[PDB]
From a paper:
The two gel-forming mucins MUC5AC and MUC5B constitute the main structural components of the mucus protecting the underlying epithelia in the respiratory system. The VWD assemblies are formed by the VWD domain, C8, trypsin inhibitor like (TIL) and E domains, except the VWD’ domain that only has the TIL and E domains. We determined the cryoEM structures of the wild type D3 assembly of the human MUC5AC mucin and the structural single nucleotide polymorphisms (SNP) variants Arg996Gln and Arg1201Trp that affect intermolecular interactions. The D3 assembly forms covalent dimers that can appear in two alternative conformations, open and closed, where the closed conformation dimers interact through an arginine-rich loop in the TIL3 domain to form tetramers.
We produced recombinant proteins with each variant separate as well as with both arginines replaced. The general appearance of the dimers is essentially identical. In the double mutant, the effect of the Arg996Gln mutation is more pronounced, bringing the VWD3 and the TIL3 domain closest together. The double mutant shows that once Arg996 is mutated, Trp1201 stabilizes the interface bringing TIL3 closer to VWD3. The double mutant Arg996Gln Arg1201Trp showed a ratio of 96:4 confirming the effect of the mutations. Even though no major rearrangements were found, both SNPs can affect the equilibrium between the dimer open and closed conformation. A high prevalence of double mutants is not observed except in Finnish population, where both mutants are present independently in 10.9% and 23.9%.
Residue numbers in the entry:
A (entry chain B), B (entry chain A): 901 to 1229
């Protein structure tokens, strides 16, 4: 159970519902109290804005704003921005970047994952079941009642469900998308050649467990649509979505190849030093000044991305100068 | 003095002449005896074929064939293929891959550099001056007489000069190219943003020496034209052309950034081992079973690409399993 918003309008609910829509507006994914009685009076809210990326019109998210007790977080250009420093209580969120994921976790039990480019995953702890409303549907493990359109009513119109959670009072109404591959037929051969890796023998373990046909067509559509420049990032995000979906099951897999989506972990390594090896499965509990060896958050998973390989001498990471120091003074 | 064929129809002669043309045919760059008296009776010849890469019609080279004493080399799909094993004399060429360059050298003194995708550079030793004919012009350090169109005549028509060196008797005549950026105006902003790095402070050392305006517009044109997919490779080749042109002067520079054209030298490193650090300047003389420490070819330059960093124990490279073994048994 985890919200899966990625690429161009691909969504997967907690209860396991897959739909699609595109719209250039502001939307909220997770709300507290559903606008009613404030039971826990926390009023958590996560919102996002879509920009017309790509000439096909298939917009993708650009910025994410998080509201928590009068505290606001702005995510844009790969840098975290905070607006509003309430002089009460304290900081309730932790900002941590792991691999190619930007992770923010709340003391309430809310965990968000950010690829810093397009994708985003939201998971909810079981104590908040049912009483959550948004585009991700009610967290009740029932794919039937996940279409509550701000009025406790389930409607078969995915477009109506998506439009019901717009934020700007004066914002253009979203509409059904076109066919990216029919729009760009000349890219179809290259797109199929690139996205065929998912059905290749490398991902056979996940193929034997889940059905990647939806993710396969998602990769094809994303590659077809991405035509204004930098299609490599579109393809990499499309693949990494299914990679994470397989990883969260529990069985680690490896899919990176120097010809496709190549990381450059050597760059962070300074001169005369080599302590950054890519970890496919995902690093276990680490040690650093902020998070000691004995302390770790197990709600996170292996994920992916370059991680430092600190020497046995000074294995603690610093997180301020991106190196392994013995201890932060 | 070095032939510089790269991207989509970009050529620079030994004597320093820059022109451009595109054509889907077979052409010869360097010929021996110019079809006349065989002085050294070596009859060296390098030929190439152009394929309609990209929807703009700007073709780029795909395969290179080398003729040397009845020995033929086929270069396609990133793998070297040899056709014709004469049962006389011996092998006169050495096939070696260094960094992101595939290098073949002849005992005569001919050196070729291959990026395995599009680009190619040809240098000539001084003993072969003047008596060489081809698209690269006569090797006499004179930009005036480099337009010999197979008849010892210089013609101001670059198109005519290019067509005069076609090989297939029945092959379509080449024509002047269009404007890639006018063809794809929506890509102009992204292309300028990507190609502006050359004029950025990183390459100021070469900016203070050579004039990169031609290379700047070449990068812009290449990024504009590359639209059928994989524009990242087009941009990377366009940048690396100027990078090599600056490197051959003598002053080493660094331009790689994990956000742009990122190498994945970590991949070659096996588990528990980190002995592949990217070298910007280019590795000095190496040691291996084929080429010992005392033996090295100094005609080559630093170039670029991932190189192994063998430990002080077993520093010899094997070249058969891509690792550093003590000595080949
Ligand atoms: Ca539901
Ligand atoms: Ca000349």
């Amino acid at each position: 159970a985890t919200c899966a918003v990625y690429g161009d309008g691909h969504y997967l609910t907690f209860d396991g519902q897959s739909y699609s829509f595109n719209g250039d507006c502001e939307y909220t994914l997770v709300q507290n109290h559903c606008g009613g009685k404030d039971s826990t009076q926390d009023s958590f809210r996560v919102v996002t804005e879509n920009v017309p990326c790509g000439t096909t019109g298939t917009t993708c998210s650009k910025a994410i704003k998080i509201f928590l007790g009068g505290f606001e977080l702005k995510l844009s250009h790969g840098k975290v921005e905070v607006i509003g420093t309430d002089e009460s209580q304290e900081v309730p969120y932790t900002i941590q970047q792991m691999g190619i994921y930007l992770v923010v976790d709340t003391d309430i039990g809310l965990v968000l994952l950010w690829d810093k480019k397009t994708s985003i995953f939201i998971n909810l702890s079981p104590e908040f079941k049912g009483r959550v409303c948004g585009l991700c549907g009610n967290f009740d493990d029932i794919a039937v009642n996940d279409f509550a359109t701000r009025s406790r009513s389930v409607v078969g119109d995915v477009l109506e469900f998506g439009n019901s959670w717009k934020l700007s009072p004066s914002c253009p109404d979203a509409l059904a998308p076109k066919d990216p591959c029919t729009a760009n037929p000349f890219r179809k051969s290259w797109a199929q050649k690139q996205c065929s890796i998912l059905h290749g023998p490398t991902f056979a373990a996940c193929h034997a467990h889940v059905e990647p046909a939806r993710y396969y067509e998602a990769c094809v559509n994303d590659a077809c649509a991405c035509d204004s420049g930098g299609d490599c990032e579109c393809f990499c995000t499309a693949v990494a979505a299914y990679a994470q979906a397989c990883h969260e099951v529990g069985l680690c897999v490896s899919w990176r190849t120097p010809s496709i989506c190549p990381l450059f972990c050597d760059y962070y390594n300074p001169e005369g030093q080599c302590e950054w090896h890519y970890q496919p499965c995902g690093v276990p509990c680490l040690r650093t000044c902020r998070n000691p060896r004995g302390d770790c958050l197990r709600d996170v998973w292996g994920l992916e991305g370059c991680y430092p390989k600190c020497p046995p001498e000074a294995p603690i990471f610093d997180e301020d100068k991106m190196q392994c120091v013995a201890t932060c003074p």
